[PDB]
Design an enzyme around this catalytic site. Structure first.
Site, PDB file in Angstrom:
ATOM      1  N   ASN A  27       1.065  -1.207   0.240  1.00 37.39           N
ATOM      2  CA  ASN A  27       0.000  -0.007   0.084  1.00 37.39           C
ATOM      3  C   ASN A  27       0.994   1.439  -0.007  1.00 37.39           C
ATOM      4  O   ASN A  27       0.355   2.382   0.393  1.00 37.39           O
ATOM      5  CB  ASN A  27      -1.077   0.068   1.063  1.00 37.39           C
ATOM      6  CG  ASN A  27      -1.872  -1.333   1.087  1.00 37.39           C
ATOM      7  OD1 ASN A  27      -2.051  -1.905   2.255  1.00 37.39           O
ATOM      8  ND2 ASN A  27      -2.356  -1.535   0.019  1.00 37.39           N
ATOM      9  N   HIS A  37       3.071   2.151   2.080  1.00 35.42           N
ATOM     10  CA  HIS A  37       3.523   2.877   3.454  1.00 35.42           C
ATOM     11  C   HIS A  37       4.724   2.008   4.008  1.00 35.42           C
ATOM     12  O   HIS A  37       4.973   0.892   3.522  1.00 35.42           O
ATOM     13  CB  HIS A  37       2.190   2.463   4.469  1.00 35.42           C
ATOM     14  CG  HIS A  37       0.959   3.328   3.997  1.00 35.42           C
ATOM     15  ND1 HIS A  37       1.046   4.793   4.283  1.00 35.42           N
ATOM     16  CD2 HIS A  37      -0.137   3.087   3.400  1.00 35.42           C
ATOM     17  CE1 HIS A  37      -0.181   5.249   3.849  1.00 35.42           C
ATOM     18  NE2 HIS A  37      -0.623   4.326   3.108  1.00 35.42           N
ATOM     19  N   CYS A  65       6.488   7.362   9.133  1.00 34.79           N
ATOM     20  CA  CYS A  65       7.219   7.979   8.422  1.00 34.79           C
ATOM     21  C   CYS A  65       6.796   7.873   6.860  1.00 34.79           C
ATOM     22  O   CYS A  65       6.556   6.895   6.343  1.00 34.79           O
ATOM     23  CB  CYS A  65       8.772   7.443   8.649  1.00 34.79           C
ATOM     24  SG  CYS A  65       9.925   7.716   7.338  1.00 34.79           S
TER      25      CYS A  65
HETATM   26  F1  LIG Z   1      -0.743  -9.551  11.570  1.00 35.53           F
HETATM   27  C1  LIG Z   1      -0.726  -8.840  10.458  1.00 35.53           C
HETATM   28  C2  LIG Z   1       0.424  -7.823  10.762  1.00 35.53           C
HETATM   29  C3  LIG Z   1       0.724  -7.177   9.611  1.00 35.53           C
HETATM   30  C4  LIG Z   1      -0.260  -6.970   8.534  1.00 35.53           C
HETATM   31  N1  LIG Z   1      -0.253  -5.990   7.417  1.00 35.53           N
HETATM   32  C5  LIG Z   1       0.324  -6.377   6.385  1.00 35.53           C
HETATM   33  C6  LIG Z   1       0.050  -5.040   5.379  1.00 35.53           C
HETATM   34  C7  LIG Z   1       0.683  -5.370   3.907  1.00 35.53           C
HETATM   35  O1  LIG Z   1       2.193  -5.694   4.063  1.00 35.53           O
HETATM   36  C8  LIG Z   1       2.219  -6.933   4.768  1.00 35.53           C
HETATM   37  C9  LIG Z   1       1.939  -6.785   6.132  1.00 35.53           C
HETATM   38  N2  LIG Z   1      -1.428  -7.621   8.562  1.00 35.53           N
HETATM   39  C10 LIG Z   1      -1.728  -8.724   9.662  1.00 35.53           C
END
Ligand SMILES: Fc1ccc(NC2CCOCC2)nc1
Ligand SMILES: Fc1ccc(NC2CCOCC2)nc1
Lengths: 263, 265
Positions: free
Chosen positions: B186, B188, B223
């Site tokens: 995304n 970020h 950030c």
């Molecule tokens: F338990 C979790 C931890 C992080 C996450 N977020 C993700 C957002 C996209 O990039 C990979 C990580 N979702 C669930």
């Protein structure tokens, strides 16, 4: 992963991870490059190595001189990619490691890569030719007939790369490695240089194009306390010429080219 | 990976990769943190959050990390198989919690544990908010009903308040900036990059002679891809403890604060 039936090549399957993909939800070229080094490493371990007995006795190591990667389709998040790898001697010049990437479900070739490695003394950093002693030690693990990921006569993997002339059209300055950029031997991972090259490509190109080909020459290593400047000039599909050099004295560490196709 | 028999938790096995290990040939804490987020993602996908609920998508709300706390007893070696189990639990209107247990696949021994606190935030305005009854009811059917804690202890380090480091810092690493590999799908900055940045101001001698046992990190502000960060560390202590602060290089705006505990090798 496992060696193939003839024991002359190695295959491994990888499931593309959530943090390994970019904004189009497909693997970045740096994730692909990390998978190439992992399958290369597993191949060396499987056959008893990646230095031979004579290399350990003479304090010699393999260092990357050139990396060339062509991607037709980047695997999506959750997709399984199968990578096959093998090695071949290039006489006393050095060794070559090739890879073929396939979509596990369709069996279709989605990418290919080739790399040139040279022998170097670990301590003095002096490049050397391969002795007949070391060549005989790894020939029993390589195909005897030539096997090329880029067989074509006059292909992109063997083209000479010129040195970018100042002023560069684009630049990203003050790049420095953090501990995650280092390998188990505390050297900057070869894949970090791919990331640094790509930092000077404008975001608009990244948002509208897909990277099809990258050729990178490795001239000198970046130390953990060095600072790098990434320079890029358009030479054109869109093609670019790249240069990585030390921020201070301007010493060249890498030069390369990229070819991008409009989405 | 797969949901467990009761469908209230998720397990996945990982083989530690060559580029994932440090100088000791064992997984770095950043590799561990990436594996935690990957198993968390696979858990969300397995139960239909392919991780926002229907009401969250309607209201433009997302989950953001407020705190991450990890304790490692043994880092898995290069080539070792590590099994990670994860689950979620509601914390009323405050937010949600995601916990993890790491085990050595061969011995079944617990080698690490982690816990994280997540808060709801409007994607556009960045305003934090409480969890509505409708959102709470949408994920309760995927959580254990009785409390299940990775850090059950009544005096655990996962809930301790972290003070703000006072200038001058004993150690610092300045001018840190993310590259494209540091961004998530995304665009970020990945939460794990902040862990790396915190660790950059620990002297190399500590890293060479100690193993990181515990890390607690509070996330205050994100950030941007064009921001520049300064990492600050002061020793607060066989064990060595440090206080950490990440702030914007220019105006000194706080982005994170944390603590680390290290044990002599
Ligand atoms: F338990 C979790 C931890 C992080 C996450 N977020 C993700 C957002 C996209 O990039 C990979 C990580 N979702 C669930
Ligand atoms: F083909 C290859 C590519 C890389 C490699 N080894 C290196 C990559 C992992 O950490 C440092 C060593 N061996 C063979």
């Amino acid at each position: 992963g496992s060696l193939t039936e003839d024991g002359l090549s190695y295959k491994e399957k990888f499931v593309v991870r959530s943090y390994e993909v970019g904004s189009n939800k497909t693997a970045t070229v740096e994730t692909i490059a990390n998978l190439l080094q992992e399958v290369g490493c597993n191949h060396a371990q499987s056959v008893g190595f990646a230095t031979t007995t004579t290399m350990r006795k003479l304090h010699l190591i393999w260092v990357t001189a050139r990396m060339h990667i062509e991607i037709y389709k980047y695997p999506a998040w959750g997709d399984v990619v199968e990578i096959e790898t093998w090695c071949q001697s290039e006489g006393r010049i050095g060794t070559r490691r090739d890879w073929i990437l396939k979509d596990s479900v369709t069996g279709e070739v989605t990418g290919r890569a080739t790399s040139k490695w040279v022998m170097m003394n670990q301590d003095t950093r002096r490049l050397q030719k391969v002795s007949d002693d070391v060549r005989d030690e790894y020939l029993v693990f390589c195909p005897q007939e030539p096997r090329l990921a880029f067989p074509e006569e006059n292909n992109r993997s063997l083209k000479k790369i010129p040195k970018l002339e100042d002023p560069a059209q684009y630049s990203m300055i003050g790049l420095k490695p953090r501990r995650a950029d280092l390998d188990m031997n505390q050297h900057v991972n070869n894949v970090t240089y791919i990331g640094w090259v790509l930092e000077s490509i404008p975001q608009e190109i990244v948002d509208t194009h897909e990277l099809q080909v990258i050729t990178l020459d490795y001239r000198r290593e970046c130390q953990q306390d060095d600072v790098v400047d990434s320079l890029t000039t358009t030479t054109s599909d869109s093609q670019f010429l790249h240069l990585l050099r030390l921020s201070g004295d301007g010493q060249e560490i890498n030069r390369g080219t990229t070819l991008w196709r409009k989405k």
